[PDB]
Design an enzyme around this catalytic site. Structure first.
Site, PDB file in Angstrom:
ATOM      1  N   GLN A 335       0.817  -1.208   0.000  1.00  0.00           N
ATOM      2  CA  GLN A 335       0.000   0.000   0.000  1.00  0.00           C
ATOM      3  C   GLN A 335       0.856   1.267   0.000  1.00  0.00           C
ATOM      4  O   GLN A 335       0.605   2.179  -0.778  1.00  0.00           O
ATOM      5  CB  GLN A 335      -0.920   0.006   1.224  1.00  0.00           C
ATOM      6  CG  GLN A 335      -1.992   1.063   1.197  1.00  0.00           C
ATOM      7  CD  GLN A 335      -2.956   0.871   0.041  1.00  0.00           C
ATOM      8  OE1 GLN A 335      -3.253  -0.250  -0.353  1.00  0.00           O
ATOM      9  NE2 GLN A 335      -3.455   1.968  -0.497  1.00  0.00           N
ATOM     10  N   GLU A 362       2.691 -26.134   8.737  1.00  0.00           N
ATOM     11  CA  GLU A 362       3.104 -26.542  10.074  1.00  0.00           C
ATOM     12  C   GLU A 362       1.926 -26.245  11.012  1.00  0.00           C
ATOM     13  O   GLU A 362       2.094 -25.831  12.164  1.00  0.00           O
ATOM     14  CB  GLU A 362       4.392 -25.824  10.504  1.00  0.00           C
ATOM     15  CG  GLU A 362       5.641 -26.449   9.865  1.00  0.00           C
ATOM     16  CD  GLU A 362       6.941 -26.073  10.563  1.00  0.00           C
ATOM     17  OE1 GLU A 362       6.984 -26.128  11.812  1.00  0.00           O
ATOM     18  OE2 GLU A 362       7.921 -25.740   9.859  1.00  0.00           O
TER      19      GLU A 362
HETATM   20  C1  LIG Z   1       3.678 -24.618   0.442  1.00  0.00           C
HETATM   21  C2  LIG Z   1       3.282 -25.635   1.528  1.00  0.00           C
HETATM   22  C3  LIG Z   1       4.281 -26.464   2.089  1.00  0.00           C
HETATM   23  C4  LIG Z   1       4.028 -27.435   3.072  1.00  0.00           C
HETATM   24  N1  LIG Z   1       5.098 -28.238   3.542  1.00  0.00           N
HETATM   25  C5  LIG Z   1       4.772 -29.249   4.519  1.00  0.00           C
HETATM   26  C6  LIG Z   1       5.821 -30.049   4.947  1.00  0.00           C
HETATM   27  O1  LIG Z   1       7.030 -29.961   4.563  1.00  0.00           O
HETATM   28  N2  LIG Z   1       5.464 -31.049   5.879  1.00  0.00           N
HETATM   29  C7  LIG Z   1       4.190 -31.267   6.379  1.00  0.00           C
HETATM   30  O2  LIG Z   1       4.006 -32.198   7.196  1.00  0.00           O
HETATM   31  N3  LIG Z   1       3.148 -30.436   5.946  1.00  0.00           N
HETATM   32  C8  LIG Z   1       3.445 -29.448   5.027  1.00  0.00           C
HETATM   33  N4  LIG Z   1       2.398 -28.634   4.577  1.00  0.00           N
HETATM   34  C9  LIG Z   1       1.058 -28.805   5.099  1.00  0.00           C
HETATM   35  C10 LIG Z   1       0.639 -27.875   6.278  1.00  0.00           C
HETATM   36  O3  LIG Z   1       1.526 -28.202   7.368  1.00  0.00           O
HETATM   37  C11 LIG Z   1      -0.767 -28.092   6.813  1.00  0.00           C
HETATM   38  O4  LIG Z   1      -0.900 -29.257   7.608  1.00  0.00           O
HETATM   39  C12 LIG Z   1      -1.767 -28.234   5.731  1.00  0.00           C
HETATM   40  O5  LIG Z   1      -1.735 -27.055   4.890  1.00  0.00           O
HETATM   41  C13 LIG Z   1      -3.156 -28.600   6.104  1.00  0.00           C
HETATM   42  O6  LIG Z   1      -3.710 -28.594   4.840  1.00  0.00           O
HETATM   43  P1  LIG Z   1      -5.005 -29.179   4.353  1.00  0.00           P
HETATM   44  O7  LIG Z   1      -5.200 -28.747   2.941  1.00  0.00           O
HETATM   45  O8  LIG Z   1      -4.622 -30.596   4.570  1.00  0.00           O
HETATM   46  O9  LIG Z   1      -6.260 -29.331   5.255  1.00  0.00           O
HETATM   47  P2  LIG Z   1      -7.534 -28.757   5.859  1.00  0.00           P
HETATM   48  O10 LIG Z   1      -7.464 -29.113   7.310  1.00  0.00           O
HETATM   49  O11 LIG Z   1      -8.598 -29.423   5.040  1.00  0.00           O
HETATM   50  O12 LIG Z   1      -7.727 -27.230   5.767  1.00  0.00           O
HETATM   51  C14 LIG Z   1      -8.797 -26.896   6.603  1.00  0.00           C
HETATM   52  C15 LIG Z   1      -9.209 -25.474   6.734  1.00  0.00           C
HETATM   53  O13 LIG Z   1     -10.232 -25.729   7.752  1.00  0.00           O
HETATM   54  C16 LIG Z   1      -9.799 -25.209   9.031  1.00  0.00           C
HETATM   55  N5  LIG Z   1      -9.979 -26.263   9.996  1.00  0.00           N
HETATM   56  C17 LIG Z   1      -9.578 -27.640   9.935  1.00  0.00           C
HETATM   57  N6  LIG Z   1      -9.877 -28.335  10.984  1.00  0.00           N
HETATM   58  C18 LIG Z   1     -10.515 -27.439  11.839  1.00  0.00           C
HETATM   59  C19 LIG Z   1     -11.073 -27.566  13.131  1.00  0.00           C
HETATM   60  N7  LIG Z   1     -11.062 -28.720  13.804  1.00  0.00           N
HETATM   61  N8  LIG Z   1     -11.646 -26.443  13.710  1.00  0.00           N
HETATM   62  C20 LIG Z   1     -11.669 -25.254  13.054  1.00  0.00           C
HETATM   63  N9  LIG Z   1     -11.137 -25.031  11.769  1.00  0.00           N
HETATM   64  C21 LIG Z   1     -10.577 -26.248  11.269  1.00  0.00           C
HETATM   65  C22 LIG Z   1      -8.279 -24.932   8.806  1.00  0.00           C
HETATM   66  O14 LIG Z   1      -7.792 -24.094   9.783  1.00  0.00           O
HETATM   67  C23 LIG Z   1      -8.144 -24.598   7.410  1.00  0.00           C
HETATM   68  O15 LIG Z   1      -8.485 -23.245   7.106  1.00  0.00           O
HETATM   69  C24 LIG Z   1       2.621 -27.570   3.545  1.00  0.00           C
HETATM   70  C25 LIG Z   1       1.615 -26.740   2.983  1.00  0.00           C
HETATM   71  C26 LIG Z   1       1.924 -25.798   1.999  1.00  0.00           C
HETATM   72  C27 LIG Z   1       0.753 -24.975   1.459  1.00  0.00           C
END
Ligand SMILES: Cc1cc2nc3c(=O)[nH]c(=O)nc-3n(C[C@H](O)[C@H](O)[C@H](O)COP(=O)(O)OP(=O)(O)OC[C@H]3O[C@@H](n4cnc5c(N)ncnc54)[C@H](O)[C@@H]3O)c2cc1C
Ligand SMILES: Cc1cc2nc3c(=O)[nH]c(=O)nc-3n(C[C@H](O)[C@H](O)[C@H](O)COP(=O)(O)OP(=O)(O)OC[C@H]3O[C@@H](n4cnc5c(N)ncnc54)[C@H](O)[C@@H]3O)c2cc1C
Ligand SMILES: [Co+2]
Lengths: 379, 379
Positions: A335, A362
């Site tokens: 901004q 994480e």
């Molecule tokens: C660029 C990138 C690199 C990554 N590298 C690693 C890595 O090296 N190692 C590793 O282990 N993981 C890694 N991850 C994964 C990261 O650690 C998260 O665990 C992951 O993004 C969860 O993603 P999701 O799409 O599985 O799930 P989801 O859980 O489906 O996403 C859920 C959405 O719902 C909300 N939500 C889910 N459960 C609840 C609840 N009980 N109450 C309220 N809100 C809830 C969340 O907060 C989120 O907004 C990476 C992710 C990215 C994007």
């Protein structure tokens, strides 16, 4: 009480800062745009001794502590969060072996990471499950002197570049959290594919992969701890590794403050440096408030961990808070640049795209809050 | 680096906590509703050794440092920010004497404040000026061994209860800030009136006054420092006294989290305790995030002050931030209580009223931001 850095820490800080400015800062834009891993930087990292430096001196590392990681992390991430994610993720994969591995495994898995430019990885998330380590689908069936690993891991940082990966898998779905086992899978192991993920909004320099394990045979000499201990390992690791994510966030926020201020002083409007305008001054002030408060709480979290004190709640707070103020900071930094802030010709734009990820990986800030809520409602 | 507390500090903490709990909290509502100073509480503070404890041992005090202040301040404010403001403001009155008073003045002025329940006061603000300190109108014309004081001071805490009041006046408006001088004025001096302010929204237990000086004779023996040194004295004082205001904010915020937590665990809705609802959990979490991050940064600022390092920016940040998160915590605590939070029978409603003042006195959060802005742009 004392919040001062020791003479060595300042040295480590200066080194880190020196490396970020001279090595990372110059190629940041290049790799973000090519979306390729800057191996030359990793090599440079190793040479200057800051690659996998958390490895104890007994295996070739500097034995760097959490306070030290925070110190270094903020400096690296300041130049580029995406590039910082490479060594940060590597320390993540290393953490489980440090916590659960035996002397034999530490020496075996950690030695190769101090001798050359090598990376480690942590594979917990899966395509349909990234927030519940108790419902992992990847299966590990013990079959004699080895486990037969089958399943797909998703979003793995350093997935394709690492020598080996710490894979969390379930030996029994019905046992839920108690069914998890930690296994170190080496890079060449047959039936272990690594597919690179492309098209990310930020941290493009960091390599993220989908990992496919087809009847992968992993020796029991590669299991960290015992069966049923996988979950506790993944959780104890994350309680510590989230601190560096908070440290990185602080670094991005600081970088946002620096760019914004330098621009505010030079850019004029209505016959005067925009920095002279109170609305712009307050944006800068809010950046520094988040930065200063987030760094101090991040240091406190690192302190607790380094003292062997409970820190699950503190690192969750640091990670969620820092990443949130870091995002607001980058937004305002853009901004403050005006139209120039909207193009990659300037650095503020990339900051926003990078820092957003810190609110997601994480563990998302929602589960971070869920972690804090538990600490709060506990009896 | 070490954030832990010394054994003494822990005792001191337990003392304040025990006092806040047994003495202050019970009569909090009582004095809020009468808007009267609770002298019996002031005696007990004294009796227990916590009244004006910042006065060095040489003069009968405990010689408490800023870090100790923060520790004691959080506990006392926890029970009531209004009552706490009495000793806090007394510490404020004492500060200019400690920073620039001679051994002789320290003994004369501070000894009376350790031998019995007595208060000091700090008068800088005036009816037509509070933020623009360097534009005081109160005149102090020199007539030999003394000054003839004329003017009015506004919003003075402990104004009428004080033994003496450090008054900041100008010796010549034209010199602007270079014309400010600090003078101690004794409670009975001829031509010195104290008028109590009534109808405050909060911190009602604390006496706020309008001080009127009409040809008041003040001997140079009562001047703190040299002429033209008043501004430095006032600023250096505030650079340190802002930390305690941050402490109290954290205290109030902690009270809000405690009330809101307790109430949410017991109160049912839709056949379940409201604490089981995510939205409610999140409010609680944001309270803790604010409390934790604000407390560590207040500790940090307190550390810089004790160590004698630059802390003008740090204290302005701690003060502005803490009072802000504390207001939000009090507001959400009221919310969580539902209709019951809206009535005096419960404690949360008063928290909001009390803590709002923390964002205004000892420098508004806007000028706190102006202070930080200068630190940021300082070439
Ligand atoms: C660029 C990138 C690199 C990554 N590298 C690693 C890595 O090296 N190692 C590793 O282990 N993981 C890694 N991850 C994964 C990261 O650690 C998260 O665990 C992951 O993004 C969860 O993603 P999701 O799409 O599985 O799930 P989801 O859980 O489906 O996403 C859920 C959405 O719902 C909300 N939500 C889910 N459960 C609840 C609840 N009980 N109450 C309220 N809100 C809830 C969340 O907060 C989120 O907004 C990476 C992710 C990215 C994007
Ligand atoms: C209960 C109470 C007790 C107090 N006790 C004491 C005491 O013991 N001793 C003492 O010395 N003072 C005391 N004060 C005064 C306090 O320290 C401030 O100086 C005072 O609140 C300033 O108030 P104001 O109404 O005079 O002025 P104003 O400065 O006129 O209020 C101005 C409003 O404008 C904003 N503003 C002003 N200048 C700028 C600017 N340049 N840029 C942007 N925004 C600006 C402010 O942030 C504020 O919102 C007390 C105040 C209260 C309410
Ligand atoms: Co085999």
């Amino acid at each position: 009480i004392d919040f001062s850095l020791t003479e060595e820490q300042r040295q480590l800080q200066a080194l880190a800062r020196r490396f970020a400015k001279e090595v990372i800062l110059p190629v940041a834009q290049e790799y973000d745009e090519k979306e390729e891993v800057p191996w030359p930087v990793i090599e440079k990292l190793h040479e200057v001794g800051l690659l996998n430096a958390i490895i104890p001196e007994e295996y070739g590392g500097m034995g760097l502590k959490m306070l030290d990681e925070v110190i270094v992390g903020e400096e690296l991430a300041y130049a580029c969060m995406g590039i910082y994610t490479i060594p940060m993720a590597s320390d993540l994969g290393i953490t489980p072996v440090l916590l659960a591995g035996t002397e034999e495994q530490k020496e075996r898995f950690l030695r190769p990471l101090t001798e050359k430019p090598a990376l480690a990885a942590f594979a917990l998330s899966e395509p349909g499950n990234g927030s519940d380590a108790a419902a992992l689908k990847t299966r590990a069936i013990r079959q004699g002197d080895h486990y037969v690993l089958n399943g797909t891991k998703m979003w793995i940082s350093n997935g394709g570049e690492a020598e080996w990966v710490v894979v969390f898998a379930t030996v029994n779905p019905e046992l839920r959290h108690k069914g998890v086992v930690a296994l170190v899978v080496e890079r060449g192991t047959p039936g272990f594919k690594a597919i690179k993920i492309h098209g990310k909004m930020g941290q493009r320099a960091s390599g993220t992969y989908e990992l496919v394990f087809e009847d992968v045979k992993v020796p029991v000499e590669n299991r960290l701890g015992e069966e049923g201990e996988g979950f506790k390992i993944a959780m104890q690791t994350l309680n510590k590794t989230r601190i560096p994510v908070a440290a990185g966030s602080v670094g991005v926020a600081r970088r946002a403050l620096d760019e914004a201020r330098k621009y505010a002083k030079e850019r004029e409007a209505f016959g005067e440096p925009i920095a002279n305008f109170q609305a712009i001054q307050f944006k800068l002030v809010d950046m520094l408030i988040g930065i200063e408060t987030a760094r101090m709480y991040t240091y406190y979290a690192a302190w607790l961990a380094d003292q062997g004190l409970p820190h699950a709640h503190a690192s969750a707070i640091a990670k969620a808070y820092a990443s949130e103020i870091a995002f607001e900071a980058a937004n305002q930094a853009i901004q403050i640049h005006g139209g120039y802030g909207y193009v990659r010709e300037f650095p503020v734009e990339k900051l926003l795209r990078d820092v957003k990820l810190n609110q997601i990986y994480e563990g998302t800030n929602e589960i971070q809050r869920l972690i804090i809520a538990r600490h709060i409602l506990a009896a």
